[PDB]
Amino acid sequence: GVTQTPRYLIKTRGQQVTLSCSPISGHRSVSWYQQTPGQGLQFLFEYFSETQRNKGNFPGRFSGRQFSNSRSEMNVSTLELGDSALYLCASSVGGTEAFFGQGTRLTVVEDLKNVFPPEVAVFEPSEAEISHTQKATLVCLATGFYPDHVELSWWVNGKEVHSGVCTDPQPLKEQPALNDSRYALSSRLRVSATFWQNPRNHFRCQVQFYGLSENDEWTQDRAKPVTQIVSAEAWGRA
Amino acid sequence: KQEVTQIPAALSVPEGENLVLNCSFTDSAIYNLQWFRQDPGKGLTSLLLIQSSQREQTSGRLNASLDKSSGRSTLYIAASQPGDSATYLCAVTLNNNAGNMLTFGGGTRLMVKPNIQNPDPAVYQLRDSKSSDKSVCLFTDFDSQTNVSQSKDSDVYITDKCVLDMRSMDFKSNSAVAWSNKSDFACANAFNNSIIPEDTFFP
Amino acid sequence: IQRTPKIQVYSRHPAENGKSNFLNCYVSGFHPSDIEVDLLKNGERIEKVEHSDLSFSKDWSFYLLYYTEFTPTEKDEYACRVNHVTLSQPKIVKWDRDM
Amino acid sequence: GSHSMRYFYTAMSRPGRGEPRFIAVGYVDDTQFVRFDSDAASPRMAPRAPWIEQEGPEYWDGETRNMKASAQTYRENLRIALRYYNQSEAGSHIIQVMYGCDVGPDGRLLRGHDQSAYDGKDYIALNEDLSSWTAADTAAQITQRKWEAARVAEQLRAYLEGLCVEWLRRYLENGKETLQRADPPKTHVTHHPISDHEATLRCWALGFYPAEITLTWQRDGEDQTQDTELVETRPAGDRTFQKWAAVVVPSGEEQRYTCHVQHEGLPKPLTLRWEP
Amino acid sequence: TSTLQEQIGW
Ligand SMILES: [Cl-]
Ligand SMILES: [Cl-]
Ligand code: NA
């Protein structure tokens, strides 16, 4: 498929970003789009044979290029907070339909000091629940993270699990009265009471966070909020 | 000049019911029409491609029709399932443009709510302080008609309802989570701003 | 494949001394596209000469029209000079007002 | 009558003399209306007929961005053709393309075209069904297989049956006064004695549009084809054409020779004779 | 555009 890099990016107001798109091998045309919650998917430009053949309505600071191997890049100059969005590319050839990449999730921040990793905690099933329903629900909470660049997963006995799982589609603002407000995400895993009542069964809640890169600077007392996994665990109880 | 419209922009449907998603476009001279789904924190997933008004593309329970003259397309979802919940986007490409050049509609957020056969609404208490200052309350097994409202208090955090599927046992359940730092926070008054069932079991 | 240009030298309208006209040189049926075409007045190169944009026929052979505004006289002689890979030397075709 | 829109591309490599040159020209019937040259100081699609000059900046910008993209595509196609034909990078080569649509008096599509050539010979052409291709050699079969897999005929068909026809229909209306009004030929017969007993009878046709014409000499009603010195139809330089048919006749029976002029601009075919 | 937008090479 089409591959886009980076998957996640944090940049500061006024600086520049360059995003890359490798179309499917043999595809010759690439289009770029910006998706924001409030403006939907908006077209930036189409490249074919290294040329900006079609252009949308974004200003000059949104620019691009395409190389002889059909790989394309787009660049945003003087980043504004409003530029935080999912940037998608799609490729095609001849009479085919569009094939989209997975996007670059860009967050433009007021300062790198607003960036925080999550804190993860697992909460074990209520004995009242186990007695009333013969089921056990584990709750995982990821809190204090910013920006919303996280992937939460459940792992039972070393294997990623999806049955009996449900995570919030959108996270909670810890202080809705703030733009730089940190976030909170919850997720649940429900198993049978018999499965929870077995200490051999291991349960882990993992939260992959995407933060600052190597080149990013850090002048704070707390640990640098780089890309990292934060987890919490619990084991079955007889 | 090409404008793509999806009305309604949101739909909340009980599981099992057949549903239709609508798409209209102002310029009929299109080459392709594509339907996509978009899951939270994800990019686009192509569902179906349609190019002929006389033909009808199908992909399991998904079916799509096209009428270029009228500037219309419909996406049919037979026997909707909770896993169908997502934003559905329709997009059209003009003739003499790359297939990657699309005009997108605004999307329809589809929510297919589970059929709770035997509801048993309850609020349960989960693990006190050890690695976190919080105390978690779990409102669960309530029927899908039940709506969960956000807390009035700034130090109490409530998530929206969420559907889990224990596929192995053909069992589905709704749930919402409430948590706070404050000592006065209790399961009994956690979901006070929400209309919860009368028979809610409070252990 | 190489094709030799056909050359036609003529005026836009029937010639009349002292009256404004256009001197044309139409080169066609040639391949490859590189061609040197010059219009001549008494054997000297006319500097004010324009040409049509390179196009071609159904058989892929190219054609071009070279033209200049002129006022013909009975003493003045005009010709078209053409060179292409298919010609060992430039070919001069003289304007004969009756064809 | 029937009408056509055609675009003609010529892409020519010139190793050691810079990037390959790309020239595009557009025509409606026998009238050129647009030009693009990659060698211009500021390459752009530019008007060549009065009726297209009115088009707005969105038109000129769109065609220019497309022509710049096509110029680079044909530079890459020139490199690909060298690999397909196992040719060296030292030689100069040419790709040519001809494409467009034909419409009837009703403005409906009669036929779509998309033909290419490499070094003056057929390379690949879209068939009349607009869903298959004709490759003319084994190198073009590599392009055929690639284009069949990438659904190119469907993409071409959508253009040829849509915007090609739609734009041709707009040009024919905007320029109806010159494009849809046939200019009949101004004809005359000249006499030039070539010997004591022979003379040349030249049957001229001037300022006619469109270029399609038929000139035929006749000795007492009999069509003389072998004794006719027929020149190729040539442009006058003002969007009209010229053509002549000369015959060698015995000095005396010049008036037994009649020229038959056939052209769309004439309600009935004309008959000419030398009038001393 | 009035001209064909090409979508592939040779
Ligand atoms: Cl990439
Ligand atoms: Cl667009
Ligand atoms: Na090859």
CSV table of C-alpha atoms in Angstrom, one decimal, chain C residues 1 3 6 8-14 22 24 26 28-29 31-34 51-63 65 67 97-99, chain D residues 8-10 12 23 25 27 32 35 48 94 96-98 115-117 119-122 188 190 192 202 204 206 231-238 242 244:
chain,number,residue,atom,x,y,z
C,1,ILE,CA,13.2,6.3,-41.1
C,3,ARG,CA,11.7,11.6,-45.1
C,6,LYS,CA,8.6,18.7,-50.0
C,8,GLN,CA,6.5,25.0,-52.1
C,9,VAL,CA,7.3,28.7,-52.5
C,10,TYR,CA,4.4,31.0,-53.2
C,11,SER,CA,2.6,34.2,-52.4
C,12,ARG,CA,-0.6,34.4,-50.2
C,13,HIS,CA,-2.5,36.1,-53.0
C,14,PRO,CA,-1.8,36.4,-56.8
C,22,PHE,CA,2.8,37.6,-48.1
C,24,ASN,CA,5.3,31.8,-48.1
C,26,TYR,CA,5.7,25.6,-47.0
C,28,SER,CA,6.1,19.3,-45.4
C,29,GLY,CA,6.4,15.5,-45.5
C,31,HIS,CA,11.1,13.4,-40.6
C,32,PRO,CA,13.0,14.0,-38.3
C,33,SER,CA,11.7,17.5,-37.2
C,34,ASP,CA,15.0,19.5,-37.2
C,51,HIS,CA,6.9,30.4,-38.8
C,52,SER,CA,3.9,28.3,-37.8
C,53,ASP,CA,4.1,25.9,-34.8
C,54,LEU,CA,5.5,22.4,-35.5
C,55,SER,CA,2.7,20.0,-36.4
C,56,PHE,CA,2.3,16.8,-38.4
C,57,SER,CA,0.1,14.8,-40.8
C,58,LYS,CA,-1.6,11.4,-40.4
C,59,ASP,CA,1.5,9.6,-41.7
C,60,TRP,CA,3.6,11.4,-38.9
C,61,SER,CA,5.5,13.6,-41.3
C,62,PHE,CA,6.0,17.2,-40.1
C,63,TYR,CA,5.0,20.5,-41.7
C,65,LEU,CA,5.0,27.4,-43.0
C,67,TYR,CA,6.2,33.5,-44.0
C,97,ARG,CA,4.6,33.8,-59.4
C,98,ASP,CA,2.7,31.5,-61.7
C,99,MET,CA,2.6,28.5,-59.4
D,8,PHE,CA,-0.7,16.9,-31.5
D,9,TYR,CA,2.4,16.4,-29.3
D,10,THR,CA,6.0,16.1,-30.5
D,12,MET,CA,12.3,15.2,-29.2
D,23,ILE,CA,5.7,20.9,-28.5
D,25,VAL,CA,-0.5,22.1,-30.7
D,27,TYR,CA,-6.7,22.1,-33.7
D,32,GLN,CA,-4.9,25.7,-34.9
D,35,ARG,CA,0.3,26.1,-28.7
D,48,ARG,CA,-3.4,30.8,-31.7
D,94,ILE,CA,11.0,11.5,-31.3
D,96,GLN,CA,4.6,11.9,-31.5
D,97,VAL,CA,1.0,11.7,-30.2
D,98,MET,CA,-2.3,12.5,-32.0
D,115,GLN,CA,-2.4,7.2,-31.4
D,116,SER,CA,1.3,7.4,-30.7
D,117,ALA,CA,4.4,7.0,-32.8
D,119,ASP,CA,10.7,7.7,-34.6
D,120,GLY,CA,7.9,8.3,-37.3
D,121,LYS,CA,6.3,4.9,-37.1
D,122,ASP,CA,3.1,3.6,-35.3
D,188,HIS,CA,-9.5,30.8,-62.0
D,190,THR,CA,-4.4,30.4,-66.2
D,192,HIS,CA,0.9,29.4,-70.3
D,202,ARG,CA,-3.4,25.7,-64.4
D,204,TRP,CA,-6.2,27.5,-59.2
D,206,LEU,CA,-7.6,30.1,-53.4
D,231,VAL,CA,0.2,20.0,-55.9
D,232,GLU,CA,-0.3,19.3,-52.2
D,233,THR,CA,-2.9,21.6,-50.5
D,234,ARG,CA,-0.9,24.4,-48.8
D,235,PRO,CA,-1.8,27.1,-46.3
D,236,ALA,CA,-2.2,30.7,-47.4
D,237,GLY,CA,-1.2,31.9,-43.9
D,238,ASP,CA,-4.6,33.5,-43.0
D,242,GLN,CA,-4.7,26.9,-51.8
D,244,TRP,CA,-3.8,23.8,-58.2
